[PDB]
Structures are given as C-alpha cells and as structure tokens.
Write a protein that binds this ligand. Structure first.
Ligand SMILES: [Mn+2]
Ligand SMILES: [Mn+2]
Ligand SMILES: [Mn+2]
Ligand SMILES: [Mn+2]
Lengths: 439, 439
C-alpha cells in the first residue's frame, strides 16, 4: 500500500510533464511503445525482452511486448495491454495490480491488430519507441522527436517519491545478493559460483539483472567491464570485485564492493583507505554543486592514495598535475541512477538538451549536471593495476616516479571499486546502500 | 585431440558442400557474417550475443561478433577474426585453438574497418548473414540467396563425425544438469531453485543454454512452453517436468524428464507407461522411414494410454480416428537436433528445398523428412491435461467420451514429456541420453 499511495502523485507528475511538452511542441499526445521480442536469425527462439524505458517510466510492466500508452496529460492515460490467449503459454489475469485503476485498459489479443485501437488521425501524435518501420506502417510521421526526448530525459533526473521508494527496494534486494556473493568468495568459490549465489539470494535470474554483473577474482578485478564467469576457481584467492544490482518495478540498483581474501596485508589496507575516500565523496554531494567538481575531488583523493601507499613517489598535487591518476582511475566517478542504470539527463544544463561542459582536464566525463534534491547518484571511485595503461605509463617521462616493484605485488589483486547509491534531499543525503548495513 | 582429429574431415565436408553449391549457382564465394551485438533502445547495454548458425557451422566461435568467413570450397577458408585491444575488456590470445590452422586468419581491431579485408569486387559473392543494410553498404548485392540457404540447410541434417562428437559432449553436460534438477525437486525446491541447481551442475549460465529451460511444478507441467521460474515452492509437491539442454561448440542437447514426487500412485504409473512408449518410439528410428510414420505411431500409443487409464471411455483406435489424441498430445513427436535446437532441413524432400508433405491427419507436423544415417533426432512424446484444449473438447460431440472426473484428478500433476536425443547410424541407433545412465 505505501508504494500504491505514492504512485498517484507519480502519475500526476507524469501527466503534468506530458501536458507541458506536448503543448510546447504542438502535439496532441505521445504514443509510447513497450517494444517487441526480437527473433534470432534463421531461428524460432527470441532474445530476452527489454522494455522501452519511456514505457516503464509510466508503470511497472517490464516483461510485456506489444503494449502501448497513449497520453496527452489531460485525459486519463490509455493502455493497450497485450494479452494473448494461447494454450502453450500461461494466460495471466487481466491487469488488477495497484497501477491498473490509473489507466483506461484495452486488451490486445494479436500484435498486428493494434491499428484499430490507436488514434485515427496521427498527424499530431509522436511515436516514442524503437520500431520506426512499424510506426511508419501504422501512419505515424513523428518519431522520437528530439525536443520531447530531451525534455523527458532532463526531468527523469528528478525522481518522484514513488521512484525513490522503488530505488530503495532495488537496493534492499541487491544487498542480499552482495552478502551471499561475499560469503561464497570467502568459501573459495569460482566467479561462476559467486554469480549464481548472487542470483539465488536475489531470487532474480541473469536476464532480470539491470546489467551484466561483474564478478571478478584476482587479476580480473583490473578489467573494469569484465563480463565472463570462470567456472573453475583460481588456485589462489587474493581479491574479489563484484558490481551487481537488482530490479524493482523497472528501477535499478548498482552496487560495487571489493574484498581481500586474507582480510589483512597491504591490499586489505588499500581497500579500507579507498572506502574512507568513497564515503567522504558520497558525503560531498550537495545541491548547487556541479557533479564534475566531485570527479575532480576524486582524482585528488586517488592521488593521495597513490602517494600515501608509495605506488607513485610524488606528493598528491604533482600526481594530479602530471595526469598520472588517469592510469589508475580511468573512468567517471559515477552517474545518475533510475529506470536505466546510467540514467538519462546526466549531461544536460537545461530542458532543451544543451550539454553542461565537463571540467577542463576531463573532456570524456558524461555526468556533469548541477546536483539538486530528489536526484539519485552512484559514487564509484576506483584504483586499478591495468597492464596496457601501466605499459603506456612506463613509456612516459613519469616512469621513474612509479614504484614498479610495488605495482608488481598489486597486479595479482587487480584493483578496487566501491560503489554506493545515494539520494540527494534538500537538507540531507540518504545512502541507500550503507543504510542497509551491507558494510 | 579426438575432436581436433575429426575436425579435419568436418572442414573437408564443408569445403565440398561450398564448392558444389557455389559452382552450381555461379558464385565466386560465400561471405558468412557471425553477426553483431544489438544495443538496447536509448541505452548503452547490449542484448546477449547470438551467433549466425551459418557461421558456427564452420568453427566453434559463438561469442565473437564482427567475424567473417570467406569460402569457395577450392582455397583455404579465410577468417576475419574480431580482436579489439581495449583496456576495459579481456584481450584474448590470437586464435591458437585446434581450428585455427584450418583458416587463413586476419585480425580485425575495429568492426567498421572490415571493408579493407573483404573481396574488392563482390558481384559474385553471396553475403550470408542478418545485417542486410551493413552488407549493402559494403557493396554486396546477393544476400541469403534461397538456393544456397536451402542446399546448406538440406545438408545440415547429415552430421560429420566432429558434429556427432560435439552433440555427445552437449548431452553429457545436460545429463549432469538433469540429475541435479531431479535431486533439487525431491528435496522440495522451487522452480527457481531447480533452474539454478541445473545451471550450477552444467557450469553454464542462462544465456549459454541453447533455449529457455522449461522448469515446471504441478499444474505448470501442462503449459508446454511455460517460461517463468516461481521463486517460492508450492505448498504441496506433486510433479516436475524439466526440458533443458546444454551447449558444446555451438551444438545443442535437448532433454526432457517428468517426475512424480511420491514415486507411486496413478500419475507415477502414467509416467512409467509413457516411458515404455518413448523407449519403443526411440528404437523405431530407421533409415528409409519417413519421420511422420513415427508421429502416427506416437498418436496410437498415447491413445492406448488414454483408453487403458480410463481417461477416455473408448477403444484406442477410436480415440485416434476421432482426433481426440491431439487434445492430450498437441505437438510434434520431435525434430532434427544440431547447431540449432530445432535443426534445419527437417521439412525437406531434396536439396532445392521442396517440402516433404506431412501425414494426412497431421498437417502442422514440421519434421517430415526421410530418416537416413548420420542424422540426429529428438523423440519426445507427451500427454498433458491442458485447460483450454479440454475446454474446446468439452464443446465438441466428443464431450460424452471424456472421463471428466479422472481428468480432474490428473490436473494438479499437469502432464508428461520424456525426450531423448538419438543418432541414427547405418546399422544401429545411439541414444546419447540413455547411454549416459540419466534414467
Ligand atoms: Mn554505476
Ligand atoms: Mn556499477
Ligand atoms: Mn525438442
Ligand atoms: Mn525439448
């Protein structure tokens, strides 16, 4: 009932957004398409279904293709709901979940019979969806118009209370996964074993994960978009990095933890120092600050670690100025989190979609937007021992400053990332991840 | 080693097929495209990669997009092998697996630079692949020509010794899965628990499965393409149906077993009788027989069961002649098995692609082809208590013949399917599934 009560105000906010952008762009409405199942080439099997984010923005229906929302922000939202009646599939009930009473629902038995249920004159309706050829055949001429997409993507950064509650519930599920993964690692499990313990504890299958989990042991922790799951355990367990989430009502969690098998020695100490810096970066989110400023602070803190552990034999300020931090921390500090894992509107200065420029030394940073209340962020500093980047560094005139001996002793551990999901309020920060006592 | 030796004859067979069809159609060669990763709408994540079957027909490279084979059957096969060298992904070794020596290999570092490595004049090359617009942009004009696709699909039914060994290896893995699933069911597991015990015993994740596993308890056994995995166990365990396989080198297993929780009572006796029929149907595969004749025999055997268990109050022969068996056994007896789960060429009378007509009373049967040696089949009789089909039957003048009381006592158990994978040799049958002592 809590989530159901909050949903009423979620619909009213989405109605108000729809009314504003449709009037501004001279449209009679939006037709939002959940998507279709993609058939495999020369085959009868399908790819796993992935819902249009613009569709699930309205309601937690994420496993149903051939659904359509028709909205103008004044009349009651219309939902065309795909309900086939075949003997070979489990026929679910007509929708009676909390969200049903907010839509005029019409049942669609066959995907290609949708034309009769869509507005007769489509001149002033925008199709929002992936299937441009289907839309054209149905008589749409306006498809994913940039001013509408930019407005909706801008405003997706401001979560309704419904959305924030969904994100709390996703974090709660992911944390149960993270505990089971950790325990499997300390029991000598393989990457494959750890992944499947995570899925067992979340009660979510691989394709319900909002992204492909990263489950890395030892040197694989240095590969920051590592995707495989080694079925056989390494002879020696040194380190473990898991980046994994969960789904709730289409909303993602995105949590990363790094562990040391021995729970002592230098790599264990490196995790603890990065954890102190990651907590402080999470507490520096503040309304009225550009996110790019926290990315700069992160480079400063990584330099402090490199200096303090005698990995680079220079004061922190010199490590930053000579660019060396980028070899050890080569990605962004984090991003917006919501319906999508790397959420929309993180690069925008305004509703029309103008980009907020990244900070001077970091031209590739894509999360640059002014922090405000009701926004949700990842904070995910990292420090890695990456062969190709350490190779490039060994060919610069900074090479004498690098403690190559000590870098060699860290390579078997791979690296470190620590990631939390944080809601910014007007006068406080809610660390959803650390409020759940994962550690 | 054994597989490596057999692969030489596999390449020679594929070279000879390529030479025959390219010369017959006046082509200089085939260009066979492994495929591409599909990006999710408005997102940076990808769908799981699914290799072009025509690509993996040549070599066990199933996880690598942007690869191309150029073959004419008269020179050494050419492989363009996609090898990105990015710091964020695992850089694999240049190919040195058993298959590498059989191709002239050129490494491709960036997908869009392939045009340099393909034949300059493409007029007489056929593109085999899904990406028609990419092929057109590269200068191809012949794409998936029907005579080439029908010829290769026709000959896919004749497995080389390499292919048969790959299929044995897949069955061996799947059988380990099946034993863990069975044991989890008898311990009171949920559908979700059973699925994840299957994945843990096969060491294969959900997306490496050659199809979506069916893991069904109780009434869900009646839903023959049931897809969900209930995370909570039912209050009472009655029955369990698992249809699941495994991958080896791109070759599928496809095994189904049905279990009774009590291991006694009428449903248990129904499994034993269906088991007798399934073994007999598996032993009736014979070179020179039309597969449709086994489908007819299956209907006769199911009718014997429906009569003998007093489910239909008619002699067996009358149940077959009035089409009543179709309400309880509504699908095909089985299909070819290979690189694809429902393998190619099952419907064909000859290499031009003419259809072998189904038996008169079974117009929807799609596995109709003359059985010959070196072909691989599924045999999968079933008997189900399906609400919507029993609903339809209750509205015909066959209603009076159905023991509705007895049907009611079976509904909680859902239904039965027993499936083996069988190689047909000149002089014998090799039941891969039962040679592995699954039961
Ligand atoms: Mn993240
Ligand atoms: Mn992450
Ligand atoms: Mn089958
Ligand atoms: Mn099957």
């Amino acid at each position: 009932d809590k989530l159901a009560v909050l949903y009423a105000e979620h619909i009213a906010t989405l109605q108000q957004r729809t009314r504003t952008i449709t009037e501004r762009e001279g449209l009679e409405g939006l037709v939002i398409h959940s998507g279709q199942a993609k058939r495999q080439f020369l085959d009868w099997m399908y790819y796993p279904f992935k819902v249009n984010p613009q569709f699930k923005a309205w309601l937690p229906v994420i496993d149903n293709p051939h659904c359509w929302i028709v909205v103008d922000g004044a009349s009651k939202p219309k939902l065309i709901f795909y309900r086939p009646v075949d003997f070979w599939h489990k026929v679910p009930d007509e929708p009676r979940d909390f969200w049903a009473e907010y839509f005029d629902i019409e049942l669609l038995v066959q995907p290609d019979q949708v034309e009769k249920l869509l507005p007769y004159d489509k001149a002033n309706y925008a199709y929002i969806g992936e299937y441009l050829e289907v839309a054209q055949a149905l008589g749409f001429s306006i498809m994913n118009p940039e001013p509408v997409m930019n407005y909706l993507h801008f405003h997706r950064a401001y979560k309704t209370q419904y959305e924030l509650e969904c994100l709390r519930q996703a974090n709660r599920i992911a944390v149960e996964g993270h505990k089971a993964a950790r325990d499997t690692f300390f029991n000598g499990g393989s990457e494959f074993d750890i992944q499947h313990a995570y899925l067992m504890a979340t009660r979510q299958s691989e394709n319900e994960m909002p992204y492909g989990n990263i489950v890395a042991l030892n040197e694989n922790c240095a590969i920051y978009l590592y995707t495989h799951f080694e079925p056989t355990a390494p002879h020696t367990h040194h380190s473990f990095l898991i980046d994994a989430g969960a789904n709730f009502n289409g909303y993602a969690a995105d949590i990363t933890r790094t562990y040391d098998f021995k729970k002592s020695g230098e790599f264990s100490d490196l995790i603890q120092v990065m954890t102190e810096h990651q907590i402080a970066l999470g507490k520096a989110l503040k309304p009225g600050l550009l996110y790019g400023e926290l990315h700069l602070e992160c480079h400063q803190r990584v330099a402090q670690v490199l200096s303090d552990f005698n990995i680079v034999k220079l004061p922190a300020a010199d490590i930053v100025e000579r660019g060396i931090t980028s070899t050890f921390f080569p990605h962004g500090l984090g991003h917006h989190l919501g319906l999508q894992v790397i959420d929309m509107g993180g690069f925008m200065a305004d509703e029309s979609g103008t980009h907020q420029a990244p900070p001077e030394g970091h031209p590739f940073l894509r999360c640059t937007r002014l922090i405000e209340k009701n926004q949700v962020f990842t904070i995910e500093p990292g420090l890695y021992f990456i062969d190709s980047l350490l190779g490039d560094l060994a060919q610069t005139d900074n090479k004498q400053f690098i403690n190559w001996e000590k870098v060699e002793e860290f390579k078997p551990f791979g690296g470190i990332r620590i990631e939390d999901n944080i809601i910014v309020h007007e006068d406080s920060l809610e660390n959803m991840t650390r409020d759940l006592h994962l550690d």
